[PDB]
Amino acid sequence: AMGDVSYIVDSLGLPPFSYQMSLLSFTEKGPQELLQLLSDVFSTISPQKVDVAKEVPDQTADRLIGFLKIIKYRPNVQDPLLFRQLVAAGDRETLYQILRWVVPQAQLLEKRAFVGYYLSFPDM
Ligand SMILES: [Ta]
Ligand SMILES: [Ta]
Ligand SMILES: [Ta]
Ligand SMILES: [Ta]
Protein backbone atom coordinates (compact mmCIF):
# COMPACT_ATOMS: atom_id res chain seq x y z
CA ALA A 1 0.00 0.00 0.00
CA MET A 2 0.86 3.74 -0.22
CA GLY A 3 1.96 4.70 3.31
CA ASP A 4 4.45 1.86 2.86
CA VAL A 5 5.77 3.20 -0.43
CA SER A 6 6.41 6.68 1.02
CA TYR A 7 7.98 5.12 4.11
CA ILE A 8 10.40 2.96 2.05
CA VAL A 9 11.13 5.86 -0.26
CA ASP A 10 11.78 8.35 2.57
CA SER A 11 14.09 5.81 4.23
CA LEU A 12 16.11 5.32 1.02
CA GLY A 13 16.70 9.08 1.07
CA LEU A 14 18.49 8.74 4.42
CA PRO A 15 21.80 7.06 5.30
CA PRO A 16 23.15 4.49 4.53
CA PHE A 17 21.51 4.98 1.10
CA SER A 18 21.09 8.76 0.67
CA TYR A 19 19.41 8.15 -2.67
CA GLN A 20 16.48 10.14 -4.09
CA MET A 21 13.84 7.88 -5.56
CA SER A 22 10.56 9.35 -6.80
CA LEU A 23 7.34 7.85 -5.47
CA LEU A 24 6.56 6.82 -9.04
CA SER A 25 9.97 5.31 -9.96
CA PHE A 26 9.52 3.06 -6.94
CA THR A 27 5.97 1.97 -7.83
CA GLU A 28 7.02 1.38 -11.45
CA LYS A 29 9.37 -1.46 -10.45
CA GLY A 30 8.31 -4.99 -11.39
CA PRO A 31 9.23 -8.21 -9.54
CA GLN A 32 12.79 -8.39 -10.80
CA GLU A 33 13.51 -4.73 -10.08
CA LEU A 34 12.20 -5.32 -6.52
CA LEU A 35 14.35 -8.42 -5.85
CA GLN A 36 17.34 -6.45 -7.14
CA LEU A 37 16.41 -3.60 -4.78
CA LEU A 38 16.22 -5.96 -1.79
CA SER A 39 19.51 -7.46 -2.88
CA ASP A 40 21.09 -3.99 -3.03
CA VAL A 41 19.62 -3.00 0.34
CA PHE A 42 21.29 -6.08 1.87
CA SER A 43 24.57 -5.32 0.07
CA THR A 44 24.52 -1.75 1.41
CA ILE A 45 24.03 -3.08 4.98
CA SER A 46 26.67 -5.89 5.27
CA PRO A 47 30.13 -4.83 3.94
CA GLN A 48 28.35 -8.66 -2.06
CA LYS A 49 26.93 -6.66 -4.97
CA VAL A 50 24.79 -9.10 -6.96
CA ASP A 51 23.03 -8.84 -10.28
CA VAL A 52 19.86 -10.85 -9.83
CA ALA A 53 19.76 -11.47 -13.62
CA LYS A 54 22.84 -13.66 -13.19
CA GLU A 55 20.75 -15.70 -10.76
CA VAL A 56 17.62 -17.77 -11.18
CA PRO A 57 14.83 -16.27 -9.03
CA ASP A 58 14.78 -19.35 -6.75
CA GLN A 59 18.40 -18.96 -5.58
CA THR A 60 17.88 -15.21 -5.37
CA ALA A 61 15.00 -16.07 -3.05
CA ASP A 62 17.05 -18.53 -1.04
CA ARG A 63 19.92 -16.03 -0.79
CA LEU A 64 17.68 -13.18 0.46
CA ILE A 65 15.62 -15.47 2.69
CA GLY A 66 18.93 -16.53 4.25
CA PHE A 67 19.79 -12.90 5.05
CA LEU A 68 16.33 -12.26 6.52
CA LYS A 69 16.43 -15.23 8.88
CA ILE A 70 19.67 -13.97 10.35
CA ILE A 71 17.99 -10.67 11.23
CA LYS A 72 14.80 -12.38 12.44
CA TYR A 73 12.20 -11.39 9.85
CA ARG A 74 8.74 -12.71 10.70
CA PRO A 75 6.93 -12.99 7.34
CA ASN A 76 3.20 -12.30 7.21
CA VAL A 77 2.75 -15.57 5.33
CA GLN A 78 3.38 -18.27 7.93
CA ASP A 79 4.13 -20.94 5.35
CA PRO A 80 7.93 -20.96 4.71
CA LEU A 81 7.46 -22.41 1.22
CA LEU A 82 4.65 -20.00 0.31
CA PHE A 83 7.03 -17.24 1.34
CA ARG A 84 9.91 -18.80 -0.61
CA GLN A 85 7.73 -18.87 -3.77
CA LEU A 86 6.29 -15.40 -3.19
CA VAL A 87 9.82 -14.00 -2.79
CA ALA A 88 10.94 -15.91 -5.91
CA ALA A 89 8.15 -14.49 -8.09
CA GLY A 90 8.94 -11.10 -6.58
CA ASP A 91 5.35 -10.73 -5.42
CA ARG A 92 4.67 -7.01 -4.93
CA GLU A 93 2.87 -7.10 -1.54
CA THR A 94 5.46 -9.50 -0.08
CA LEU A 95 8.34 -7.35 -1.29
CA TYR A 96 6.79 -4.11 -0.03
CA GLN A 97 6.40 -5.88 3.30
CA ILE A 98 10.06 -6.88 3.52
CA LEU A 99 11.32 -3.50 2.31
CA ARG A 100 9.04 -1.67 4.74
CA TRP A 101 10.35 -3.81 7.60
CA VAL A 102 14.00 -3.89 6.46
CA VAL A 103 14.70 -0.46 4.94
CA PRO A 104 13.90 1.53 8.06
CA GLN A 105 16.58 0.26 10.50
CA ALA A 106 19.22 -0.13 7.75
CA GLN A 107 21.24 2.42 9.69
CA LEU A 108 21.00 0.25 12.79
CA LEU A 109 21.64 -2.95 10.76
CA GLU A 110 24.68 -1.53 8.97
CA LYS A 111 26.22 -0.42 12.28
CA ARG A 112 25.87 -3.90 13.75
CA ALA A 113 27.21 -5.64 10.64
CA PHE A 114 30.18 -3.19 10.41
CA VAL A 115 31.10 -4.11 13.96
CA GLY A 116 34.44 -5.85 14.42
CA TYR A 117 34.98 -5.84 10.64
CA TYR A 118 37.95 -3.45 10.51
CA LEU A 119 41.18 -3.93 12.43
CA SER A 120 41.15 -0.24 13.38
CA PHE A 121 37.68 -0.58 14.98
CA PRO A 122 37.62 -3.69 17.22
CA ASP A 123 34.54 -4.94 18.95
CA MET A 124 36.46 -4.23 22.16
TA1 LIG B 1 27.29 4.27 5.77
TA1 LIG C 1 31.77 -0.32 3.39
TA1 LIG D 1 29.38 0.92 3.55
TA1 LIG E 1 29.71 -4.47 21.15
Side-chain angles (χ1 to χ4, degrees), residues 7-21 37-46 99 102-110:
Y7 215 108
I8 292 149
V9 155
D10 286 359
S11 308
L12 299 169
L14 264 358
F17 312 107
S18 280
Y19 184 81
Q20 302 312 319
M21 196 172 281
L37 176 61
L38 193 47
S39 174
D40 290 338
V41 175
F42 277 119
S43 299
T44 297
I45 278 155
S46 282
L99 289 162
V102 169
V103 176
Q105 99 188 45
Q107 215 198 21
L108 180 72
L109 295 169
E110 176 186 40

mmCIF file of all heavy atoms in Angstrom, residues 7-21 37-46 99 102-110:
data_model
loop_
_atom_site.group_PDB
_atom_site.id
_atom_site.type_symbol
_atom_site.label_atom_id
_atom_site.label_comp_id
_atom_site.label_asym_id
_atom_site.label_seq_id
_atom_site.Cartn_x
_atom_site.Cartn_y
_atom_site.Cartn_z
ATOM 1 N N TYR A 7 7.054 5.482 3.047
ATOM 2 C CA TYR A 7 7.981 5.119 4.114
ATOM 3 C C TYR A 7 9.313 4.550 3.552
ATOM 4 O O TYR A 7 10.406 4.983 3.935
ATOM 5 C CB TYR A 7 7.315 4.100 5.034
ATOM 6 C CG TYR A 7 7.684 4.238 6.474
ATOM 7 C CD1 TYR A 7 6.768 4.726 7.406
ATOM 8 C CD2 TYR A 7 8.942 3.865 6.917
ATOM 9 C CE1 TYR A 7 7.114 4.840 8.757
ATOM 10 C CE2 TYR A 7 9.301 3.973 8.250
ATOM 11 C CZ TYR A 7 8.391 4.463 9.169
ATOM 12 O OH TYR A 7 8.759 4.571 10.501
ATOM 13 N N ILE A 8 9.216 3.566 2.663
ATOM 14 C CA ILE A 8 10.401 2.958 2.052
ATOM 15 C C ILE A 8 11.181 4.044 1.342
ATOM 16 O O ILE A 8 12.378 4.220 1.559
ATOM 17 C CB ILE A 8 10.007 1.899 1.012
ATOM 18 C CG1 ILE A 8 9.351 0.688 1.686
ATOM 19 C CG2 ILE A 8 11.220 1.476 0.216
ATOM 20 C CD1 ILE A 8 8.322 0.010 0.791
ATOM 21 N N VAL A 9 10.480 4.816 0.523
ATOM 22 C CA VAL A 9 11.127 5.858 -0.263
ATOM 23 C C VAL A 9 11.816 6.920 0.598
ATOM 24 O O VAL A 9 12.965 7.277 0.333
ATOM 25 C CB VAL A 9 10.144 6.505 -1.253
ATOM 26 C CG1 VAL A 9 10.587 7.913 -1.601
ATOM 27 C CG2 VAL A 9 10.001 5.622 -2.503
ATOM 28 N N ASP A 10 11.136 7.419 1.630
ATOM 29 C CA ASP A 10 11.775 8.352 2.569
ATOM 30 C C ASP A 10 13.015 7.734 3.229
ATOM 31 O O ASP A 10 14.054 8.396 3.384
ATOM 32 C CB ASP A 10 10.787 8.860 3.632
ATOM 33 C CG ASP A 10 9.790 9.872 3.072
ATOM 34 O OD1 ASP A 10 9.868 10.201 1.869
ATOM 35 O OD2 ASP A 10 8.928 10.347 3.837
ATOM 36 N N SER A 11 12.929 6.462 3.593
ATOM 37 C CA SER A 11 14.086 5.810 4.228
ATOM 38 C C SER A 11 15.270 5.600 3.282
ATOM 39 O O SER A 11 16.410 5.647 3.718
ATOM 40 C CB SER A 11 13.698 4.495 4.894
ATOM 41 O OG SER A 11 12.596 4.708 5.744
ATOM 42 N N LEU A 12 15.011 5.371 1.996
ATOM 43 C CA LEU A 12 16.113 5.320 1.020
ATOM 44 C C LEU A 12 16.789 6.678 0.837
ATOM 45 O O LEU A 12 17.919 6.749 0.377
ATOM 46 C CB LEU A 12 15.645 4.786 -0.330
ATOM 47 C CG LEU A 12 15.081 3.361 -0.313
ATOM 48 C CD1 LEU A 12 14.390 3.037 -1.643
ATOM 49 C CD2 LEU A 12 16.209 2.362 0.003
ATOM 50 N N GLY A 13 16.112 7.757 1.220
ATOM 51 C CA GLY A 13 16.704 9.077 1.074
ATOM 52 C C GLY A 13 17.613 9.417 2.250
ATOM 53 O O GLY A 13 18.255 10.463 2.274
ATOM 54 N N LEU A 14 17.637 8.546 3.247
ATOM 55 C CA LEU A 14 18.491 8.737 4.416
ATOM 56 C C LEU A 14 19.676 7.777 4.337
ATOM 57 O O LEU A 14 19.682 6.855 3.529
ATOM 58 C CB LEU A 14 17.700 8.461 5.710
ATOM 59 C CG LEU A 14 17.038 9.584 6.517
ATOM 60 C CD1 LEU A 14 17.284 10.960 5.929
ATOM 61 C CD2 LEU A 14 15.564 9.302 6.718
ATOM 62 N N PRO A 15 20.687 7.996 5.181
ATOM 63 C CA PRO A 15 21.805 7.059 5.301
ATOM 64 C C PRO A 15 21.296 5.712 5.805
ATOM 65 O O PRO A 15 20.335 5.688 6.596
ATOM 66 C CB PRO A 15 22.693 7.727 6.358
ATOM 67 C CG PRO A 15 22.413 9.189 6.200
ATOM 68 C CD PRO A 15 20.919 9.229 5.946
ATOM 69 N N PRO A 16 21.932 4.597 5.371
ATOM 70 C CA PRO A 16 23.145 4.491 4.528
ATOM 71 C C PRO A 16 22.935 4.502 3.008
ATOM 72 O O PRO A 16 23.844 4.112 2.284
ATOM 73 C CB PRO A 16 23.694 3.115 4.898
ATOM 74 C CG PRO A 16 22.461 2.325 5.217
ATOM 75 C CD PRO A 16 21.511 3.285 5.891
ATOM 76 N N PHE A 17 21.769 4.918 2.533
ATOM 77 C CA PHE A 17 21.515 4.981 1.100
ATOM 78 C C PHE A 17 21.704 6.393 0.548
ATOM 79 O O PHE A 17 22.440 6.587 -0.417
ATOM 80 C CB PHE A 17 20.097 4.483 0.813
ATOM 81 C CG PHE A 17 19.783 3.188 1.491
ATOM 82 C CD1 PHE A 17 18.928 3.144 2.579
ATOM 83 C CD2 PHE A 17 20.360 2.008 1.046
ATOM 84 C CE1 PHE A 17 18.650 1.939 3.205
ATOM 85 C CE2 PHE A 17 20.090 0.812 1.662
ATOM 86 C CZ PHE A 17 19.240 0.769 2.747
ATOM 87 N N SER A 18 21.040 7.375 1.156
ATOM 88 C CA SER A 18 21.093 8.761 0.665
ATOM 89 C C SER A 18 20.865 8.837 -0.839
ATOM 90 O O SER A 18 21.667 9.419 -1.580
ATOM 91 C CB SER A 18 22.414 9.435 1.036
ATOM 92 O OG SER A 18 22.376 9.875 2.378
ATOM 93 N N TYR A 19 19.761 8.232 -1.270
ATOM 94 C CA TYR A 19 19.411 8.147 -2.675
ATOM 95 C C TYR A 19 17.970 8.591 -2.896
ATOM 96 O O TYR A 19 17.046 8.080 -2.249
ATOM 97 C CB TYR A 19 19.576 6.716 -3.187
ATOM 98 C CG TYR A 19 19.322 6.629 -4.671
ATOM 99 C CD1 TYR A 19 20.315 6.989 -5.581
ATOM 100 C CD2 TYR A 19 18.076 6.231 -5.170
ATOM 101 C CE1 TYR A 19 20.084 6.930 -6.953
ATOM 102 C CE2 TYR A 19 17.833 6.181 -6.547
ATOM 103 C CZ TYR A 19 18.846 6.532 -7.430
ATOM 104 O OH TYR A 19 18.633 6.488 -8.792
ATOM 105 N N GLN A 20 17.790 9.520 -3.832
ATOM 106 C CA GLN A 20 16.483 10.137 -4.092
ATOM 107 C C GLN A 20 15.675 9.408 -5.152
ATOM 108 O O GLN A 20 15.955 9.496 -6.341
ATOM 109 C CB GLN A 20 16.648 11.606 -4.484
ATOM 110 C CG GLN A 20 17.357 12.405 -3.419
ATOM 111 C CD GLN A 20 16.779 12.156 -2.016
ATOM 112 O OE1 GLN A 20 15.553 12.055 -1.839
ATOM 113 N NE2 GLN A 20 17.668 12.038 -1.014
ATOM 114 N N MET A 21 14.677 8.670 -4.693
ATOM 115 C CA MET A 21 13.835 7.883 -5.565
ATOM 116 C C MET A 21 12.465 8.560 -5.564
ATOM 117 O O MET A 21 11.968 8.962 -4.516
ATOM 118 C CB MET A 21 13.745 6.450 -5.025
ATOM 119 C CG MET A 21 13.231 5.433 -6.022
ATOM 120 S SD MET A 21 13.374 3.753 -5.386
ATOM 121 C CE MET A 21 15.123 3.425 -5.674
ATOM 122 N N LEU A 37 16.382 -4.645 -5.801
ATOM 123 C CA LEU A 37 16.405 -3.595 -4.780
ATOM 124 C C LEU A 37 16.677 -4.165 -3.389
ATOM 125 O O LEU A 37 17.459 -3.594 -2.610
ATOM 126 C CB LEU A 37 15.100 -2.796 -4.773
ATOM 127 C CG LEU A 37 14.967 -1.723 -3.685
ATOM 128 C CD1 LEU A 37 16.049 -0.687 -3.845
ATOM 129 C CD2 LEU A 37 13.594 -1.073 -3.749
ATOM 130 N N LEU A 38 16.042 -5.300 -3.088
ATOM 131 C CA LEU A 38 16.218 -5.958 -1.792
ATOM 132 C C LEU A 38 17.653 -6.441 -1.685
ATOM 133 O O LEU A 38 18.308 -6.300 -0.655
ATOM 134 C CB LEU A 38 15.259 -7.144 -1.673
ATOM 135 C CG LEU A 38 15.121 -7.729 -0.267
ATOM 136 C CD1 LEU A 38 14.914 -6.626 0.774
ATOM 137 C CD2 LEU A 38 14.016 -8.756 -0.234
ATOM 138 N N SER A 39 18.145 -6.988 -2.791
ATOM 139 C CA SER A 39 19.507 -7.459 -2.878
ATOM 140 C C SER A 39 20.493 -6.311 -2.620
ATOM 141 O O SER A 39 21.478 -6.467 -1.908
ATOM 142 C CB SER A 39 19.750 -8.081 -4.269
ATOM 143 O OG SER A 39 21.115 -8.431 -4.426
ATOM 144 N N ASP A 40 20.219 -5.150 -3.203
ATOM 145 C CA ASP A 40 21.090 -3.994 -3.033
ATOM 146 C C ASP A 40 20.978 -3.360 -1.641
ATOM 147 O O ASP A 40 21.968 -2.893 -1.092
ATOM 148 C CB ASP A 40 20.859 -2.987 -4.154
ATOM 149 C CG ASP A 40 21.366 -3.496 -5.509
ATOM 150 O OD1 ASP A 40 22.255 -4.407 -5.521
ATOM 151 O OD2 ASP A 40 20.882 -2.977 -6.558
ATOM 152 N N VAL A 41 19.785 -3.386 -1.061
ATOM 153 C CA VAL A 41 19.620 -3.003 0.337
ATOM 154 C C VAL A 41 20.493 -3.877 1.245
ATOM 155 O O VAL A 41 21.252 -3.360 2.061
ATOM 156 C CB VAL A 41 18.147 -3.095 0.755
ATOM 157 C CG1 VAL A 41 17.992 -2.818 2.234
ATOM 158 C CG2 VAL A 41 17.327 -2.110 -0.060
ATOM 159 N N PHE A 42 20.424 -5.200 1.085
ATOM 160 C CA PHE A 42 21.293 -6.082 1.874
ATOM 161 C C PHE A 42 22.791 -5.835 1.643
ATOM 162 O O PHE A 42 23.581 -5.899 2.583
ATOM 163 C CB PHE A 42 20.957 -7.568 1.663
ATOM 164 C CG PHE A 42 19.801 -8.051 2.518
ATOM 165 C CD1 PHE A 42 18.639 -8.550 1.933
ATOM 166 C CD2 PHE A 42 19.880 -8.003 3.912
ATOM 167 C CE1 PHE A 42 17.564 -8.982 2.703
ATOM 168 C CE2 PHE A 42 18.814 -8.441 4.701
ATOM 169 C CZ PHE A 42 17.649 -8.930 4.085
ATOM 170 N N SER A 43 23.172 -5.569 0.400
ATOM 171 C CA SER A 43 24.572 -5.318 0.067
ATOM 172 C C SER A 43 25.073 -4.038 0.700
ATOM 173 O O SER A 43 26.223 -3.975 1.119
ATOM 174 C CB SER A 43 24.772 -5.241 -1.445
ATOM 175 O OG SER A 43 24.408 -6.460 -2.052
ATOM 176 N N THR A 44 24.204 -3.024 0.763
ATOM 177 C CA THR A 44 24.523 -1.749 1.412
ATOM 178 C C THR A 44 24.765 -1.938 2.917
ATOM 179 O O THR A 44 25.665 -1.334 3.499
ATOM 180 C CB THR A 44 23.338 -0.765 1.237
ATOM 181 O OG1 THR A 44 23.150 -0.492 -0.155
ATOM 182 C CG2 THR A 44 23.579 0.540 1.985
ATOM 183 N N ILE A 45 23.958 -2.795 3.539
ATOM 184 C CA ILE A 45 24.032 -3.077 4.977
ATOM 185 C C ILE A 45 25.256 -3.883 5.470
ATOM 186 O O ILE A 45 25.901 -3.475 6.435
ATOM 187 C CB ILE A 45 22.765 -3.826 5.434
ATOM 188 C CG1 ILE A 45 21.605 -2.867 5.680
ATOM 189 C CG2 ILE A 45 23.052 -4.648 6.665
ATOM 190 C CD1 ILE A 45 20.252 -3.538 5.538
ATOM 191 N N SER A 46 25.553 -5.026 4.842
ATOM 192 C CA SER A 46 26.668 -5.891 5.273
ATOM 193 C C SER A 46 27.823 -5.813 4.289
ATOM 194 O O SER A 46 27.725 -6.346 3.173
ATOM 195 C CB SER A 46 26.236 -7.362 5.413
ATOM 196 O OG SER A 46 25.521 -7.620 6.622
ATOM 197 N N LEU A 99 10.688 -4.808 2.443
ATOM 198 C CA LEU A 99 11.322 -3.496 2.314
ATOM 199 C C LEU A 99 10.862 -2.548 3.403
ATOM 200 O O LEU A 99 11.673 -1.860 4.004
ATOM 201 C CB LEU A 99 11.050 -2.904 0.919
ATOM 202 C CG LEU A 99 11.835 -3.681 -0.149
ATOM 203 C CD1 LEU A 99 11.321 -3.454 -1.532
ATOM 204 C CD2 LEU A 99 13.333 -3.318 -0.027
ATOM 205 N N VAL A 102 12.526 -3.982 6.516
ATOM 206 C CA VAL A 102 13.996 -3.894 6.464
ATOM 207 C C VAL A 102 14.578 -2.494 6.262
ATOM 208 O O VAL A 102 15.494 -2.106 6.974
ATOM 209 C CB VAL A 102 14.593 -4.830 5.375
ATOM 210 C CG1 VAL A 102 16.065 -4.526 5.157
ATOM 211 C CG2 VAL A 102 14.385 -6.283 5.757
ATOM 212 N N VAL A 103 14.073 -1.741 5.286
ATOM 213 C CA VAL A 103 14.701 -0.459 4.935
ATOM 214 C C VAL A 103 14.801 0.549 6.081
ATOM 215 O O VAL A 103 15.873 1.113 6.293
ATOM 216 C CB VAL A 103 14.112 0.161 3.668
ATOM 217 C CG1 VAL A 103 14.723 1.538 3.384
ATOM 218 C CG2 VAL A 103 14.387 -0.751 2.513
ATOM 219 N N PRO A 104 13.696 0.806 6.804
ATOM 220 C CA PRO A 104 13.903 1.533 8.058
ATOM 221 C C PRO A 104 14.718 0.600 8.946
ATOM 222 O O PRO A 104 14.451 -0.597 8.911
ATOM 223 C CB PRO A 104 12.483 1.694 8.614
ATOM 224 C CG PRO A 104 11.578 1.466 7.444
ATOM 225 C CD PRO A 104 12.280 0.469 6.586
ATOM 226 N N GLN A 105 15.688 1.111 9.694
ATOM 227 C CA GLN A 105 16.584 0.258 10.499
ATOM 228 C C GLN A 105 17.825 -0.251 9.744
ATOM 229 O O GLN A 105 18.594 -1.052 10.285
ATOM 230 C CB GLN A 105 15.828 -0.919 11.151
ATOM 231 C CG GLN A 105 15.927 -2.256 10.434
ATOM 232 C CD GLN A 105 14.993 -3.314 11.024
ATOM 233 O OE1 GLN A 105 13.824 -3.043 11.293
ATOM 234 N NE2 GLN A 105 15.504 -4.529 11.209
ATOM 235 N N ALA A 106 18.016 0.212 8.510
ATOM 236 C CA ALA A 106 19.222 -0.127 7.749
ATOM 237 C C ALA A 106 20.428 0.508 8.424
ATOM 238 O O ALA A 106 21.499 -0.110 8.544
ATOM 239 C CB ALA A 106 19.116 0.346 6.316
ATOM 240 N N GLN A 107 20.236 1.739 8.883
ATOM 241 C CA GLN A 107 21.239 2.424 9.693
ATOM 242 C C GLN A 107 21.654 1.555 10.886
ATOM 243 O O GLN A 107 22.838 1.270 11.098
ATOM 244 C CB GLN A 107 20.686 3.759 10.190
ATOM 245 C CG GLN A 107 21.723 4.830 10.279
ATOM 246 C CD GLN A 107 21.310 6.018 11.155
ATOM 247 O OE1 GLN A 107 20.418 5.921 12.031
ATOM 248 N NE2 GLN A 107 21.984 7.155 10.930
ATOM 249 N N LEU A 108 20.678 1.116 11.670
ATOM 250 C CA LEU A 108 21.003 0.248 12.789
ATOM 251 C C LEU A 108 21.631 -1.088 12.323
ATOM 252 O O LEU A 108 22.500 -1.640 12.992
ATOM 253 C CB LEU A 108 19.767 -0.055 13.639
ATOM 254 C CG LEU A 108 20.249 -0.976 14.767
ATOM 255 C CD1 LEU A 108 21.104 -0.183 15.772
ATOM 256 C CD2 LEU A 108 19.118 -1.691 15.462
ATOM 257 N N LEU A 109 21.153 -1.637 11.211
ATOM 258 C CA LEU A 109 21.637 -2.953 10.763
ATOM 259 C C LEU A 109 23.057 -2.848 10.223
ATOM 260 O O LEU A 109 23.867 -3.723 10.476
ATOM 261 C CB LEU A 109 20.705 -3.576 9.709
ATOM 262 C CG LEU A 109 19.314 -3.912 10.263
ATOM 263 C CD1 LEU A 109 18.358 -4.277 9.151
ATOM 264 C CD2 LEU A 109 19.408 -5.048 11.283
ATOM 265 N N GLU A 110 23.345 -1.763 9.496
ATOM 266 C CA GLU A 110 24.684 -1.530 8.971
ATOM 267 C C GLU A 110 25.688 -1.398 10.107
ATOM 268 O O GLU A 110 26.740 -2.019 10.064
ATOM 269 C CB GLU A 110 24.760 -0.277 8.096
ATOM 270 C CG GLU A 110 26.197 0.016 7.642
ATOM 271 C CD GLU A 110 26.331 1.322 6.896
ATOM 272 O OE1 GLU A 110 25.680 2.314 7.297
ATOM 273 O OE2 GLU A 110 27.073 1.360 5.889
#
